[PDB]
Amino acid sequence: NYSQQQRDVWRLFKYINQPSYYKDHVEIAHSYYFYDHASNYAKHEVVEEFYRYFKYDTFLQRGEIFSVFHGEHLKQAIALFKLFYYANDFDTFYKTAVWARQHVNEGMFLYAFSVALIHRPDTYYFSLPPIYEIYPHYFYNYEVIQKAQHYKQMYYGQDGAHYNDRTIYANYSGYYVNVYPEQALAYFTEDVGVNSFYYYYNLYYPYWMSGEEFNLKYDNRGEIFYYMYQQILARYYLERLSHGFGEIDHFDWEVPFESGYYPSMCYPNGLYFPTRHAYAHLYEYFYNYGQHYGFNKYAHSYTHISDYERRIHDVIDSGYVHTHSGQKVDLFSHEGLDILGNLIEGNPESPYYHYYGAYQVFARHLLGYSHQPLTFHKLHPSALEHFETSMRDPAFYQLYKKLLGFFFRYKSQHYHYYDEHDLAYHGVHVKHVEVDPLVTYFDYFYADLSNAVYVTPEEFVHDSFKVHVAQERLNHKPFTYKIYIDSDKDTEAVVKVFLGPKYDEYGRYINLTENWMNFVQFDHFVYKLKSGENVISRNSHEIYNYIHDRTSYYELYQKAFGVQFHDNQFFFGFPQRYMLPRGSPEGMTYQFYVFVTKYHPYKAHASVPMVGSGMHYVDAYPMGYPFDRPVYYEELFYALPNSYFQDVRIYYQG
Amino acid sequence: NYSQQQRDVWRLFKYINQPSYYKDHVEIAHSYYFYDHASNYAKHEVVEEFYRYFKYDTFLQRGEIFSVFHGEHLKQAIALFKLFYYANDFDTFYKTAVWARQHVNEGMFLYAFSVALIHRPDTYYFSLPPIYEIYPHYFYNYEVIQKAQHYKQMYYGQDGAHYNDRTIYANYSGYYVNVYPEQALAYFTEDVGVNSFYYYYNLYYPYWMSGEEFNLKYDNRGEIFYYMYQQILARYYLERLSHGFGEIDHFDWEVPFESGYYPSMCYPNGLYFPTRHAYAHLYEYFYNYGQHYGFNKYAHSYTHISDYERRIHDVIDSGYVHTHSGQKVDLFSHEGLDILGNLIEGNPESPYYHYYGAYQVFARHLLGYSHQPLTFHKLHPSALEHFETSMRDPAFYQLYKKLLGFFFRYKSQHYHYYDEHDLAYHGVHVKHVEVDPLVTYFDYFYADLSNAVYVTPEEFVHDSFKVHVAQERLNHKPFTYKIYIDSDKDTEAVVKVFLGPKYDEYGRYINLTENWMNFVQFDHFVYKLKSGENVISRNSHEIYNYIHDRTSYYELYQKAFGVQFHDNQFFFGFPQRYMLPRGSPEGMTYQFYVFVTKYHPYKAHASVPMVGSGMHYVDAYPMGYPFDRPVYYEELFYALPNSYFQDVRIYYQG
């Protein structure tokens, strides 16, 4: 049944670094042969491609590091995902998944299987075990994995109820070593929930998936790319303001990269993560000094980065894009932001991928600053080269701020600033907003770390060994804010609440003209107004639209994890405990912007909740609609009756 | 008995990272109290000092990294060594050793115990288990330790004769990552035998031990410092010539350090070794960027290095040393090289330690290029900051070449070049030298790696788990060289054979004037000549005087390890398999210099073989006597009848 399919899906993720020792899994893997049948998949091309990869010494063996930002790794993972996705029936998909689990590389199998599960018509609504639990090596410092393995080695017969079911109290990166100050925001950048958010966003909309083939173009994906990255940057800026940090550092490709990253994580094969030192020179000569290369295109990541940056600048200035036809494509269309997002991201929907390329891929390779692989099968990728650990690197935020500057330039040059009438909602007036005291504190979070040790077959079958990891994760006391609206008739409005800063780290007031980009979508719902006075009450545990529209969320929770506050993986999901940025004992001061507008339903492609169905969104206004473009008159945003600015102090206790 | 004492000493070194689970060890540690007795040690000051360190929160707890190049680590290790050494009877020493094993930090205990054992009157002749087996984390890449721990976790009841007694085939540093080319000589720099040699040399003559208190001044220690480091540098240069490398890179403190080091080792607490990146800036600002410091003197290692280098330059130029009396001390005495060695090294015999200081300590701290410790108990030292891993870093060789340049300057300015009469041995003529074909090849070396995993008490007591590591170590086919001498009367001569290069990496002939420093002491023995023709036959397995005089060696082998080719630890010990530098299939060409001189017995302080007894040496000539100073006429060294130059090709096969 659906419950049994869910349980089997979860079973498939146990002890990924080891072969599946379940009897059914072993039998299925040893007896099944995808190429032998070759008829149960909707397409024979996908199976033929995967067979070509698998047989003729062009496949990533078990035990090798997998990176989705390496070309051949990506090609093989795509082939496996297509094999999983084009299974005519779920039974064939399960047999293929079991075989791949037992035979295909661990990281490659995990990525292909996850993308298939979120994207398959049948298994879209399947919950997935938290990634930080499945593959913990990417989420905890090696001082935690090594301690878990200490307990595992010591747990043998003697000393019962000792070295078992033990809680490892992990610290964040800067506890032991005095790492670079930017890594002081380690409890946020290295939070398992935030990295899970980024990883699940990339699972939902992979940078290599084509919107024509996989229906991701009905979700725009360019506006998604832009809005998701801008919201991540804005939430990071809010956290930095909380901790007294300033705006994210600006960096030049031609100046030594002033920031260094010292990861504390380790690969399951005993290989430590690459380290980027302070003031690292990013030039071909310096970042390939003392290396072989010769036929590695990533060795020249600097020249490719400069080329793609130049091309993006040119297309944004002109507003005219080059296509394979070499013709003139208008970028001023209604969906010009979408075209720009596809162009910059590098997804198969890019106007000309050969010309604009994957700027982010080469930027991550260069800023990761690790040795170029001697061979395909001997690769040493950095944090920036994985989705699960990208947010841990400050260079991640600096790189994507450099990217979003391009979108800001496009909007500034080609978008007309909103006037009073465009934002006006005649007959609606937000009288005042009451928000309960916003308090943020730290609490311990317990996660099943047992997947980081090597279990014996009996232990595997019975899960006898248990080892937890406890981590201080920011949490907030539940709050409920009220919105009072005085309408003129029974209209159907859309309410959009934003969270942004009012004062910078130096206490200076930030004008909306230089502050529109720092606003974080706090809630985005639809309310049916009535003539006269209305009161809108919203709880903290009812907000599912943080920095992202998730309208069909919680119906998947009520089914999969609804058989509380359990890692969803449904849509993207920002941690409910990280919604409010850390405050101060005195209370760092932010402001909430409340907006109300008439309903504009989105062009939903289909009713079924699914990636690419278009059912995600609330309204058809541009994402972050009031602040999606530069603001030329702050007093205009203050004077709108259907708007309201309200100031709150978030209090940190601990 | 002596055998039982040896077995107990070896037992003390099992599973150092874990508490000793032997019943006797636990009983002794829990019942014994060194401060409680306080009378069994020759001095109450040492016990009082160690008690002060141990009780009042100024002691290094178990599980913390220990570095002998940190001031407070060194002070505590010295206190513990003095506690071990001043045990009036061996029984008290054993009780103290057991207690420290069970209670004192692992690295600190290991260092203090080893130094005491080599330096104690009673236990000088005790063999010690190989350091690369006792504390393998400093000798193998973490890809080996993690694999051993994989096997340990998997070895539980099921799968017998599987994951036990397994051989791990380890590779050298550049196998996986394309590390900097200087790390291509990894099979030599990272050889367990060579690093054991350096570590045992530093155990025998620690940089902090006073020659007055511990009789190390009867071994000069300054000439030892110089000659040992010069011979290490020369052997490294021979290896570099074998592999086509050139002279060791010269570096300026004021220019970015062009070489980078990427260690693959990991600390037992799951912390990866520090990495030095290519072209690392060594200035205060750059190597402390983004760090706290504030009361760390090592934070200003650059200024201290410059100061001490300036002082050393000044004293070598003047030949006049500053003392606490501030008076003029002649450096031109017979033992002026000894004074210079004590001055540069920084041992308590230094003429004024406050003024000249420990140049090597700060140089290692700076070139290690790691984060300065946030606290005494949270330290992250580099390879250069341990004796067991110093030779793995190319910066080690560059640093000590920079040091030995000072001694070269002293000798060039203040020593008169030898004439024909000084080197003459009238009546002696080396007719010709025959050396068997010198062949070097690789073979697997098996070492007990079981000490890198965590065993249960029953496994500890029975040593049930066994895991070996196999490594390709250079070995040479046994050879026997003949020396023909035509004497005039029955004299007693000293034979000194040197190994040095004839052609550089570019095929150019090296003149003795620029080649005297590159000669490696191959053998140094005494033969009783007879009137007329003599023939001297020496086997390869009878040479114990490689780059170091060990006359009282092999009598300790015949007793301790003599109850073959087992890691000695007696005196220093260069690996017998690394005596001949790797050749080439065509055969890299070197030359042997054979010298004969009349006997000059050394001023032996005592007959008993022991560190500081002066019994090490063969003759009283200056170490490397023919080549201890610059050569102003190579033809002079060729024309001496009692000398002979012979060319050999060493053939590499494999």
PDB file of C-alpha atoms in Angstrom, chain A residues 329-403:
ATOM      1  CA  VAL A 329      15.336  37.731 -28.828  1.00  0.00           C
ATOM      2  CA  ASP A 330      13.501  40.400 -26.837  1.00  0.00           C
ATOM      3  CA  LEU A 331      14.327  40.310 -23.124  1.00  0.00           C
ATOM      4  CA  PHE A 332      11.716  42.985 -22.319  1.00  0.00           C
ATOM      5  CA  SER A 333       8.802  40.542 -22.555  1.00  0.00           C
ATOM      6  CA  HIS A 334       6.586  39.901 -19.548  1.00  0.00           C
ATOM      7  CA  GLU A 335       8.688  36.790 -18.871  1.00  0.00           C
ATOM      8  CA  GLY A 336      12.013  38.561 -19.332  1.00  0.00           C
ATOM      9  CA  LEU A 337      13.097  37.903 -15.757  1.00  0.00           C
ATOM     10  CA  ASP A 338      12.425  34.213 -16.386  1.00  0.00           C
ATOM     11  CA  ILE A 339      14.579  34.270 -19.523  1.00  0.00           C
ATOM     12  CA  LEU A 340      17.355  36.021 -17.606  1.00  0.00           C
ATOM     13  CA  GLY A 341      17.152  33.459 -14.807  1.00  0.00           C
ATOM     14  CA  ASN A 342      17.351  30.552 -17.237  1.00  0.00           C
ATOM     15  CA  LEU A 343      20.247  32.266 -19.024  1.00  0.00           C
ATOM     16  CA  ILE A 344      22.281  32.900 -15.870  1.00  0.00           C
ATOM     17  CA  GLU A 345      21.528  29.582 -14.164  1.00  0.00           C
ATOM     18  CA  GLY A 346      22.508  27.556 -17.222  1.00  0.00           C
ATOM     19  CA  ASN A 347      19.606  25.113 -17.236  1.00  0.00           C
ATOM     20  CA  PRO A 348      18.665  23.451 -20.548  1.00  0.00           C
ATOM     21  CA  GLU A 349      16.103  26.257 -20.938  1.00  0.00           C
ATOM     22  CA  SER A 350      18.968  28.732 -21.354  1.00  0.00           C
ATOM     23  CA  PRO A 351      18.637  30.751 -24.592  1.00  0.00           C
ATOM     24  CA  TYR A 352      22.030  29.459 -25.751  1.00  0.00           C
ATOM     25  CA  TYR A 353      23.812  27.237 -23.241  1.00  0.00           C
ATOM     26  CA  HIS A 354      26.967  27.046 -25.368  1.00  0.00           C
ATOM     27  CA  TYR A 355      27.381  30.830 -25.205  1.00  0.00           C
ATOM     28  CA  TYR A 356      26.252  31.756 -21.680  1.00  0.00           C
ATOM     29  CA  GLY A 357      27.128  28.454 -20.024  1.00  0.00           C
ATOM     30  CA  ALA A 358      26.975  27.446 -16.375  1.00  0.00           C
ATOM     31  CA  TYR A 359      28.466  30.471 -14.649  1.00  0.00           C
ATOM     32  CA  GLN A 360      27.599  29.083 -11.210  1.00  0.00           C
ATOM     33  CA  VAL A 361      29.330  25.754 -11.909  1.00  0.00           C
ATOM     34  CA  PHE A 362      32.675  27.314 -12.797  1.00  0.00           C
ATOM     35  CA  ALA A 363      32.328  29.938 -10.064  1.00  0.00           C
ATOM     36  CA  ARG A 364      31.866  27.166  -7.495  1.00  0.00           C
ATOM     37  CA  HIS A 365      34.827  25.244  -8.906  1.00  0.00           C
ATOM     38  CA  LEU A 366      37.080  28.309  -8.745  1.00  0.00           C
ATOM     39  CA  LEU A 367      35.978  29.562  -5.328  1.00  0.00           C
ATOM     40  CA  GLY A 368      36.113  26.062  -3.860  1.00  0.00           C
ATOM     41  CA  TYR A 369      39.861  26.285  -4.497  1.00  0.00           C
ATOM     42  CA  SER A 370      40.753  22.588  -4.396  1.00  0.00           C
ATOM     43  CA  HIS A 371      43.152  20.439  -6.383  1.00  0.00           C
ATOM     44  CA  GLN A 372      41.839  19.626  -9.831  1.00  0.00           C
ATOM     45  CA  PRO A 373      41.065  15.895 -10.080  1.00  0.00           C
ATOM     46  CA  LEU A 374      43.894  13.792 -11.445  1.00  0.00           C
ATOM     47  CA  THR A 375      41.200  11.556 -12.927  1.00  0.00           C
ATOM     48  CA  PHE A 376      37.436  11.225 -13.088  1.00  0.00           C
ATOM     49  CA  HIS A 377      37.549   8.509 -10.415  1.00  0.00           C
ATOM     50  CA  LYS A 378      39.887  10.456  -8.070  1.00  0.00           C
ATOM     51  CA  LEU A 379      38.099  13.709  -7.248  1.00  0.00           C
ATOM     52  CA  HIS A 380      38.465  16.005  -4.226  1.00  0.00           C
ATOM     53  CA  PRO A 381      35.559  18.467  -4.322  1.00  0.00           C
ATOM     54  CA  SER A 382      34.984  21.347  -1.928  1.00  0.00           C
ATOM     55  CA  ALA A 383      31.953  22.442   0.071  1.00  0.00           C
ATOM     56  CA  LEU A 384      30.829  24.760  -2.735  1.00  0.00           C
ATOM     57  CA  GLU A 385      30.744  21.765  -5.098  1.00  0.00           C
ATOM     58  CA  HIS A 386      27.939  20.031  -3.167  1.00  0.00           C
ATOM     59  CA  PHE A 387      24.380  21.212  -2.614  1.00  0.00           C
ATOM     60  CA  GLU A 388      24.342  19.849   0.944  1.00  0.00           C
ATOM     61  CA  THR A 389      27.300  21.984   2.090  1.00  0.00           C
ATOM     62  CA  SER A 390      27.145  25.064  -0.155  1.00  0.00           C
ATOM     63  CA  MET A 391      25.631  27.349   2.483  1.00  0.00           C
ATOM     64  CA  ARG A 392      28.446  26.524   4.925  1.00  0.00           C
ATOM     65  CA  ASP A 393      30.922  28.521   2.809  1.00  0.00           C
ATOM     66  CA  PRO A 394      30.835  32.350   2.992  1.00  0.00           C
ATOM     67  CA  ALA A 395      32.039  32.326  -0.610  1.00  0.00           C
ATOM     68  CA  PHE A 396      28.639  30.813  -1.423  1.00  0.00           C
ATOM     69  CA  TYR A 397      26.844  33.958  -0.275  1.00  0.00           C
ATOM     70  CA  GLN A 398      29.432  36.264  -1.846  1.00  0.00           C
ATOM     71  CA  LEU A 399      29.214  34.419  -5.180  1.00  0.00           C
ATOM     72  CA  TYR A 400      25.442  34.530  -5.287  1.00  0.00           C
ATOM     73  CA  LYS A 401      25.342  38.193  -4.265  1.00  0.00           C
ATOM     74  CA  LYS A 402      27.653  38.818  -7.221  1.00  0.00           C
ATOM     75  CA  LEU A 403      25.141  36.927  -9.370  1.00  0.00           C
TER      76      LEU A 403
END
